[PDB]
Write a protein that binds this ligand. Sequence first.
Ligand SMILES: CN[C@@H]1[C@@H](O)[C@@H](O[C@@H]2[C@@H](O)[C@H](O[C@H]3O[C@H](CN)CC[C@H]3N)[C@@H](N)C[C@H]2N)OC[C@]1(C)O
Ligand SMILES: CCCCCCCCOCCOCCOCCOCCO
Ligand SMILES: CCCCCCCCOCCOCCOCCOCCO
Ligand code: NA
Ligand code: NA
Ligand code: NA
Ligand code: NA
Ligand code: NA
Ligand code: NA
Ligand code: NA
Ligand code: NA
Lengths: 350, 350, 350
Amino acid sequence: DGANSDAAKEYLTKDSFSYEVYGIIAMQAAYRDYDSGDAKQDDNLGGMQLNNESRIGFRGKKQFANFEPTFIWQIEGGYVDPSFGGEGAGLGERDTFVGFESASWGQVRLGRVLTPMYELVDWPASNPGLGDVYDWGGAIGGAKYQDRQSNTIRWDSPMYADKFSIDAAVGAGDKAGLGAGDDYWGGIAAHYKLGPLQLDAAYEGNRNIEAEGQTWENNTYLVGVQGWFENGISFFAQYKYMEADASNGVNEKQDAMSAGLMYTTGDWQYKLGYAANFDLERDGKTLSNTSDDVVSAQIMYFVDPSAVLYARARMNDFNEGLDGLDDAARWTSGTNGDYNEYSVGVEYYF
Amino acid sequence: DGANSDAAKEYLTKDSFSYEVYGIIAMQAAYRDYDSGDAKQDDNLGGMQLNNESRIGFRGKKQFANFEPTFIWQIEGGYVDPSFGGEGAGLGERDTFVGFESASWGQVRLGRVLTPMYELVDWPASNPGLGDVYDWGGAIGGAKYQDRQSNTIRWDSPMYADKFSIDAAVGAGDKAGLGAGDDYWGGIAAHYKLGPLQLDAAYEGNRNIEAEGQTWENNTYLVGVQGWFENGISFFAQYKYMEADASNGVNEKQDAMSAGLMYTTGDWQYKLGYAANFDLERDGKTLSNTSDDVVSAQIMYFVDPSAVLYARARMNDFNEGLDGLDDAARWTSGTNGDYNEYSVGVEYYF
Amino acid sequence: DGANSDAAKEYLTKDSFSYEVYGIIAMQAAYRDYDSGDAKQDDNLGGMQLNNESRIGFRGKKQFANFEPTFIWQIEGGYVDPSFGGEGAGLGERDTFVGFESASWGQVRLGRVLTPMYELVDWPASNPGLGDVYDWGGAIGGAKYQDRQSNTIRWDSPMYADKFSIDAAVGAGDKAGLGAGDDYWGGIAAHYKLGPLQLDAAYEGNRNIEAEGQTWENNTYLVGVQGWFENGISFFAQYKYMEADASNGVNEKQDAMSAGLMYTTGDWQYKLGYAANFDLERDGKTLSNTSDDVVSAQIMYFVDPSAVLYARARMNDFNEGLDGLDDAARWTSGTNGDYNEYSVGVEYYF
Ligand SMILES: CN[C@@H]1[C@@H](O)[C@@H](O[C@@H]2[C@@H](O)[C@H](O[C@H]3O[C@H](CN)CC[C@H]3N)[C@@H](N)C[C@H]2N)OC[C@]1(C)O
Ligand SMILES: CCCCCCCCOCCOCCOCCOCCO
Ligand SMILES: CCCCCCCCOCCOCCOCCOCCO
Ligand code: NA
Ligand code: NA
Ligand code: NA
Ligand code: NA
Ligand code: NA
Ligand code: NA
Ligand code: NA
Ligand code: NA
């Protein structure tokens, strides 16, 4: 069984107690109110649900006797009981990898991690609740980018000159990872600290992506600013340019932004979010009402050095529909309709 | 990813070493002898199997700095290799929840737990091996009650006056948990200790259940006694009334009982149990041969304060079949036929 | 739920801290180049992939107060993110069992383990990368033997006279474990160490195996030698004879060999491996082009007492096709075509 059987137990010396067990406990009671234009469908999707995103993980580091880079590894399970889905999570569904890190050249990781692009798209630009629009939202064909991805080599640089830092990565695609395609992708991201600000830029290219009966080339570019100030204010703003190119000559473009404001004061943190996709342009013809936007408010309370309570409201107004290149409806995050969500939740880290 | 991604790891202080790892090791070597009236089907279902119900779990408590109630959480994986099923269980398949508790008002839990009704159906009734008949057995339409269920808020009262105790909960149904329905349920249970006896009462109502082309209403009532005596005798008895009501006017009723006698002597414990479903009445007319009954015997031996060995035999006589309100056979615990079972097993708690 | 509900938590004394957490970290970057005579399939199946075979497990032992044999238990999860498959593994997918052990007669284990034959087929044969041909390779009908299998009772003898050793087991088949068949199997294996050499023999018989419209009986025999010398040289050689017999009278026979050479020198270990399946004989007529071959080379580096690095190249030349007794293509490990593979990897034991 496996590349080297269980011969690891028979020949190597067990490095006893060289692990940390960790977990994030996270529950969110969330009520959803849909306006899909169908009353029956509105009642199924909408309602109260308990979105339990708790998870257990294991991680550790080892200094190999005869290797300069330090070995690192991680196995993090998925959400134990998310909303809209069944119970029980596997080990290895979130960030799971081995890797090396030397003070001389930064960090390398092989396995299942976030692409340099998505890492910025996810945080800060997706919080709180902007993900339906800015994360996996959109109308562009092909693969706008990957999120958390397996079969990935990712290199994380150290803080160069105490201001600059780099992340770059390449990997196989979703279909390639199952032996049923040859899609691949690559991407890189940059960060520069200019005082209390931080500037960000990132790129990602996806290739040989089969969808809607075509092969796709996807290119996505991103710029953003982030600020933290001592009076308590933090902000973030981001602009995102999405370009898709199909094998039948069809070109596609769509852009999007995300911005968030927050005031931390003592034991409280107030926060407003807004993100939006602009109209999608296919073959140089703007498609009417292909945009999405979402507004969001949240009050958080630092109940413990290790935990927080929070309430949150948000309203998603999605596009009115899109047609695919195969002459059938193309799924978007708004296929299920506009909806509002009100929720309270807890998060705790041990 | 998620309501707050990995922002808990980057910003919150890791409460290091504040978790418990626990497990129940449980193996059951079980031979089954089926009498379904088909020699082939008898041979597939019947035979020797290893029912491995072992499980690993994680749990903990934390006193939040600025909150009086103590935080609680649990994540329990399911059976690692049960009979009739493939190997491997996810993390979070069993009781998995967050909650708070103060000794003045008991505990509240959010997540996936046992409903107050089913908990009594589970223990003391249903043991040993009475479950096929009393637990998920029956012929009534809709949902007589839920088992272990997600999207549940449940409050467990403290022991008032050291004699009275209460459990209550409400939650989402199976289809709602996937955004495909609007079913819900609620229930309550009461306990009173009168010396060596204990009285039990419980209710559960199920609403908006889609099945066999109808919407269903379910109502279930339960009463029971339990006795522990120093001489060594222990017993339990229970009566259960189930009322279902369909959207096309059809009414349905069925009742059941469960009783068990037990003799503990030193390191040994003998136990004989009986459970039965009585004929189902649809539209106030008894349906012939819709009953089920089971007899069961078991010898247990306390090999360690932390483990037990046990032998057990049981014979199940199931109902012979009934059609649902859609004119198709309604699945029951006897769809696979009658069967007797002989088994040995171990249980261990770390 | 289950054979005894959650009554183990309610009555038994938690044997706190009698659990060990263990894991094997294993990542392999593997490039594949397929030449199946189909270009689209060559590129889907072929390419670079990251085969993460890491795994977490738990094991422990307990001395029961009122039992002389020591109780042992194990729950080992599966590969967290293997190549050609999705992410996330269950708890209990690798070796998972309960058992007892006394120094007088060895150990007995109930659950999920390797059959005495496969353990030898697995290690030392099949390494490095000979498994496609020697492990699950072959063209014989029915089931030559089981891999890691559930519903198994297995006995491992002590080291008799410091030279002799025996392993034997019996269990249920793949279909029987799901209530859909009555297949079973049994097998035994013996080892004798003569100085720097070691002699190996094993047998396994499988019965009531349903496939290709017939029921099958399988008989598989194996002999092998292993050598370790102070010079640094080690080798292994194995011959395998497989006999299958169908319910329509059709007989089939096929044999195979596996061989490996290794030179350990300081912190490096070189290794050449070869394994092959010979032409398949059905009804005493050798079938043309049913043989399989694989050559493999490997460089290993003991990077730490607890880990190794390795590079590996290997060439797989498979059979040209075979028809089953149902007059349809019979799946073999070469159905997807020939492929060569170049790979690097790390393995770590904590
Ligand atoms: C990251 N969260 C994901 C989110 O990315 C998204 O994923 C969609 C997925 O739902 C779509 O699939 C959905 O719509 C299909 C329309 N023909 C039918 C099947 C349905 N599950 C996929 N076609 C594309 C993914 N990006 O919706 C599911 C989710 C779990 O919330
Ligand atoms: C630093 C602050 C920057 C704020 C930038 C805000 C950009 C706002 O532009 C939004 C344009 O998109 C409008 C979306 O229209 C709604 C679409 O929904 C209806 C279906 O078409
Ligand atoms: C314990 C000693 C180990 C010996 C292993 C020897 C490995 C090399 O032996 C190769 C023998 O190959 C035989 C080829 O058989 C031809 C096919 O005949 C079978 C007809 O069904
Ligand atoms: Na709903
Ligand atoms: Na990295
Ligand atoms: Na992806
Ligand atoms: Na590939
Ligand atoms: Na069987
Ligand atoms: Na349920
Ligand atoms: Na993969
Ligand atoms: Na098997």
